[PDB]
């Protein structure tokens, strides 16, 4: 129960009378109850790395012994909540303390125990029914958007002996009671899970469904899959805000978990100011994405343990909402800062410095964290299937992808959306460079595309090859100029420009292409590639004649068609329904076919 502080040197506190303590357990040191992690044991002397500043912690101070490791506290109240990396509810600490600082050793519960929740038990469950870990034994109306399914913890099972009637309950109320081998377990609406322990699932299915974002470049050229693993460069003008906002507002992800993991103070202030104001249209009503989002936000002056465990807290919350049956999108703002916190912990423990000073396990930690992303058959009786898509961003030193953190992240992840400050300056938004980006889920999504969007795969391959050919010809243009380019080279260049400026380029502020449905995206790409193929066919088949066609001839004859191709962006998905947009694109293709037939 109670230890005592036998010594204090920096953040390391050696506690006596700690015979029963467990390795990597959590302890409240001092009279202010500073959080601390047992990092060593020697007889009764347990060494503790104290998260908060140890100034004023005097010998003889009691050391309360929490019977758990660093464990997130799951249950209603997560949604719309701003936590620290340690699950400290900043938004509740500020309200209760009426201060701009975080009091040393603040012990505010992660989830409010006073707020009441409308809880409806599973109708089938009774007294005596067999229940198993992962079973949804109730549903709580947390929001008009997210129904929080209260479910049994893993490692728990038995026969229900009391299930509460529908009503208003708090996180401290006992909503269920079960028995196994005579041992009786009373379960409230809140459970606790170690952050560093993977939440079990009945099976980890392959990722076979897109994580649509609405950005044409991301959805079409470089698709990510629900349960995917993605990386994003972190720079000043890169534009990661567009990716975060798209995933938060328009993506099919049922839940969003944004982990700052040690950002600058003002950067985190910007995130905390912007995310609450973002709104999404669900069921015709403009709700707030914070009805379904949670923010594990912490700055660079927070406890290093909090910064290093922010990623684990975020992934554990994402896994919880996945098991609930949802599709969650976790977004680490900069895993580089988490890796810096990890290196700092290694230095504090005086562990051997591995490659470029990072710990001897950086790759293992990153791989194990990214392994928690995926699509699973959620554990429990109600057949569910959730997912956790990690979009953790990394910060390459000066644009170099060779540092240990970026190298490990690129090796582990399967998508890299490669935002570019160069394109940001050129005003090509989104700034995805579409040359260093990549996606390894194309072979996984082949089945989905063939079922729903049959032609999209050849369209995307042709677009990618067009862009590659344009990149290769960019050098030839310098050597011999544009006048020396063949007609096929000219058509490739002038459709590559069309794709760059009119397909990849997309403005998130306009009401018509802030969110681009995949049907619209594939329609635009199909029209562009049809133009390219038919122009190339005309050029090749008139190369043999004296009246050979040229790109100049085609442009002069069909300036209207090129204008319409450029204006395909301006079709509003909302006002111009799917049927209307598809019909208009089909009419456009008819016009192109008529014009090309007349010209040829």
């Amino acid at each position: 129960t109670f230890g005592y502080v036998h010594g204090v040197s920096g953040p390391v506190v050696t506690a006596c009378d700690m015979a029963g303590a467990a390795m990597y357990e959590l302890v409240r040191v001092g009279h202010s109850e500073l959080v601390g992690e047992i990092i060593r044991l020697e007889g009764d002397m347990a060494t503790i790395q104290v998260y908060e500043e140890t100034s004023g912690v005097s010998v003889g101070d009691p050391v309360l012994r929490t019977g758990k490791p660093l464990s997130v506290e799951l249950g209603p109240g997560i949604m719309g909540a701003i936590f620290d990396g340690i699950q400290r509810p900043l938004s509740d600490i500020s309200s209760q303390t009426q201060s701009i600082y975080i009091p040393r050793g603040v012990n505010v519960s992660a989830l409010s125990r006073d707020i009441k929740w409308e809880f409806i038990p599973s109708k089938n469950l009774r007294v005596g029914s067999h229940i198993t870990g992962g079973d949804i034994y109730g549903i709580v109306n947390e929001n008009s958007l997210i129904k929080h399914k209260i479910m049994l913890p893993p490692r728990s099972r038995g026969s229900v002996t009391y299930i509460a009637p529908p009503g208003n309950y708090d996180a401290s109320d006992v909503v269920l009671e079960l028995e196994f081998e005579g041992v009786k377990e009373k379960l409230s609406m809140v459970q606790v899970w170690p952050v560093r322990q993977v939440r079990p699932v009945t099976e980890k299915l392959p990722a076979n469904h897109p994580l649509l974002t609405g950005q044409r470049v991301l959805d079409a050229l470089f698709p990510c899959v629900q349960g995917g693993t993605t990386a994003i460069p972190g720079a000043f003008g890169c534009g990661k805000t567009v990716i975060s906002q798209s995933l938060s507002k328009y993506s099919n992800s049922d839940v969003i978990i944004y982990v700052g993991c040690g950002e600058r103070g003002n950067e985190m202030s910007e995130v905390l100011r912007d995310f609450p104001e973002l709104t999404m249209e669900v069921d015709g009503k403009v709700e707030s994405i914070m009805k379904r989002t949670a923010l594990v936000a912490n700055t660079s002056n927070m406890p290093v343990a909090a910064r290093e465990a922010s990623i684990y807290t975020g992934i554990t919350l994402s896994e919880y909402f996945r098991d609930m049956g949802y599709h969650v999108s976790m977004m680490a703002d900069s895993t580089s800062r988490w890796a810096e916190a990890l290196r700092e912990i290694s230095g504090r423990l005086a562990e051997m410095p591995a490659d470029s000073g990072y710990p001897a396990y950086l790759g293992a930690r990153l791989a194990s964290f990214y392994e928690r992303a995926g699509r699973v058959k959620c554990l429990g009786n109600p057949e569910r299937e959730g997912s956790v898509s990690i979009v953790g961003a990394v910060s390459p030193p000066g644009g170099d992808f060779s540092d240990p953190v970026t190298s490990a992240t690129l090796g582990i992840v399967q998508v890299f959306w490669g935002l570019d400050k160069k394109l940001a300056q050129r005003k090509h938004f989104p700034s995805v460079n579409w040359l260093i980006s990549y996606s390894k889920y194309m072979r996984a999504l082949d089945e989905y595309y063939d079922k729903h969007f049959t032609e999209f795969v050849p369209l995307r391959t042709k677009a990618k090859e067009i862009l590659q050919e344009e990149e290769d010809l960019a050098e030839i243009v310098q050597l011999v100029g544009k006048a020396s380019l063949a007609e096929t080279d000219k058509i490739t260049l002038e459709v590559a420009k069309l794709i760059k400026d009119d397909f990849l380029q997309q403005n998130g502020y306009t009401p018509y292409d802030r969110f681009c449905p995949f049907y619209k995206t594939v329609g635009m790409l199909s029209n562009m590639i049809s133009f390219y193929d038919m122009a190339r066919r005309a050029v090749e088949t008139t190369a043999q004649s004296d009246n050979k066609i040229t790109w100049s001839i085609i442009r002069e004859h069909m300036g209207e068609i090129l204008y319409k191709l450029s204006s395909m962006k301006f079709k509003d998905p909302v006002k111009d329904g799917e049927a209307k947009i598809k019909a208009d694109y089909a009419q456009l293709l008819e016009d192109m076919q008529n014009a090309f037939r007349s010209l040829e």
């Binding site: 015979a19 029963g20 303590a21 467990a22 390795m23 990597y24 357990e25 060593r40 044991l41 020697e42 007889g43 009764d44 347990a46 490791p69 560093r196 993977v198 980890k204 392959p206 562990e351 051997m352 410095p353 591995a354 490659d355 001897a360 396990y361 790759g363 293992a364 791989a367 194990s368 990214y370 392994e371 928690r372 995926g374 060779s402 190298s407 690129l410 090796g411 582990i412 390894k440």
Partner: protein, 459 residues
């Protein structure tokens, strides 16, 4: 057999990193095994890394997190780590600690084999000379494997080393113009990699003869130190006692080496280059040198470790020591992969130490060595010509340089490049090599003796 009851100690003196430390141990045995029941009933395993008087440092395989000092009870098996081995292990899936994860029963042991094995009497060791027809042109033609050889696949993150290994598995057979049991250990491999290998072995009808030891990324780190040894003990039983021909595939030897470095750092052992323990060479040797044929026994163990070179650095300690130990290396090239050449094998840094005896007259064909050497020389000169051309441009290249560049293009397009399911015979690979060499006049092929050139060149 041990009949005395085994002692259970609650005397856990201290815990630090992955090293429990027990006191009042009665005659501790080094390398002994211990079973730790934690306070919450969780049963972990560990190995006595050191003994001193009544103290015993117990490296726990699952990590020391949650270990208590007064309540954890560690019972001492009285014996070093022994795997239960039976032929029925073929066609099963085990985790990194040899415990089944395919919902089958535990292994009804035919024998209990020490996990570390024994070094084979060099006087009784046979030298591999039976060339394996992997079907890969880059391997058969220029890095020919021999049955009973340690030839790791050096690669990098994201490259098709898994695809190359699976292809070797599914089209590896003797050049006699019988099946290869496969023992596949995987250390810290993502679920996608594990599923790829399992699904390929299932798509082919080889899941009867394949035994999988799996230790994914989320699984315990220390257990990777024993996964290769479990796999190689099973392979040794199947080869030297059951007379099978066992292809052992140890995936992510980089993960194994990093786990070893973690344990060495916890022990504060002497570090080598880039922090790896000073004995990493000896440990990787204990892993790799459990290969090759043996006198009087018709079995063999062929090892193809797949290791990821950090930052594509062939001089990184892991690949460097692995090359020092093993009998070659197949170098998967990022440049070729980016150019979309499959398999992206760079023969220049690749090597096979037993090709010299596995090729020639009798086995395969008699122009094999000369063709391979000439292809190496011409490929190297083509690369040098490319390097000089980057500086001096096209117009400054002589006709010989143009010949070499054409050879390089056609060699990377017709010899290295190959279908993922295309199984070229050694003779087909040599014919491709000859049609490539015929680009040059006879006088430009200085490696091949005139006797060989006269017979083979004209056709």
């Amino acid at each position: 057999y041990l009949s005395q009851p085994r002692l259970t100690y609650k005397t856990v003196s201290g815990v630090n990193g992955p090293l429990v430390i027990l006191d009042h141990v009665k005659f501790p045995r080094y390398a002994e095994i211990v079973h730790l029941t934690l306070p919450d009933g969780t049963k972990r395993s560990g190995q006595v890394l050191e003994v001193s008087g009544s103290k015993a440092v117990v490296q726990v395989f699952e990590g020391t997190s949650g270990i208590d000092a007064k309540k954890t009870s560690c019972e001492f098996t009285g014996d070093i780590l022994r795997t239960p081995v039976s032929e029925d292990m073929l066609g099963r899936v085990f985790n990194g600690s040899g415990k089944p994860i395919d919902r089958g029963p535990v292994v009804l042991a035919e024998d209990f084999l020490d996990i570390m094995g024994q070094p084979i009497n060099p006087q009784c060791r046979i030298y591999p000379e039976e060339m394996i027809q992997t079907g890969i042109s880059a391997i058969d033609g220029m890095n020919s494997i021999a049955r009973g050889q340690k030839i790791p696949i050096f690669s990098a993150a994201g490259l098709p080393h898994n695809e190359i290994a699976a292809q070797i598995c599914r089209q590896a057979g003797l050049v006699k113009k019988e099946n290869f049991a496969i023992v596949f250990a995987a250390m810290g491999v993502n679920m996608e990699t594990a599923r790829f290998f399992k699904s390929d072995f299932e798509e082919n009808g080889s899941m009867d003869n394949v035994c999988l030891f799996l230790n994914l990324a989320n699984d315990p780190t220390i257990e990777r130190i024993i996964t290769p040894r479990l796999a190689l003990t099973t392979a040794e039983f199947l080869a030297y006692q059951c007379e099978k021909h066992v292809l052992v595939i140890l995936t992510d030897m980089s993960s194994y080496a990093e786990a070893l470095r973690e344990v060495s750092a916890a022990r504060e052992e002497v570090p080598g280059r880039r922090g790896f323990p000073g004995y990493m060479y000896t440990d990787l040797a204990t892993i790799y040198e459990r290969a090759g044929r043996v006198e009087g026994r018709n079995g063999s163990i062929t090892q193809i470790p797949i290791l990821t070179m950090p930052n594509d650095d062939i001089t990184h300690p892991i690949p460097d020591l692995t090359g020092y130990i093993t009998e070659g290396q197949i170098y998967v090239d990022r440049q070729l992969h980016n150019r979309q050449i499959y398999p992206p094998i760079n023969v220049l840094p690749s090597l096979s130490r037993l090709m010299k005896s596995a090729i020639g007259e009798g086995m395969t064909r008699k122009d094999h060595a000369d063709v391979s050497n000439q292809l190496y020389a011409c490929y190297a000169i083509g690369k040098d010509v490319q390097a000089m051309k980057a500086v001096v441009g096209e117009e400054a290249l002589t006709s010989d340089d143009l010949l070499y560049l054409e050879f390089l293009q056609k060699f990377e397009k017709n010899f290295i490049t190959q279908g993922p399911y295309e199984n070229r015979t050694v003779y087909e690979t040599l014919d491709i090599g000859w049609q490539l060499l015929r680009i040059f006049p006879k006088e430009m092929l200085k490696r091949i003796p005139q006797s060989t050139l006269s017979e083979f060149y004209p056709r």
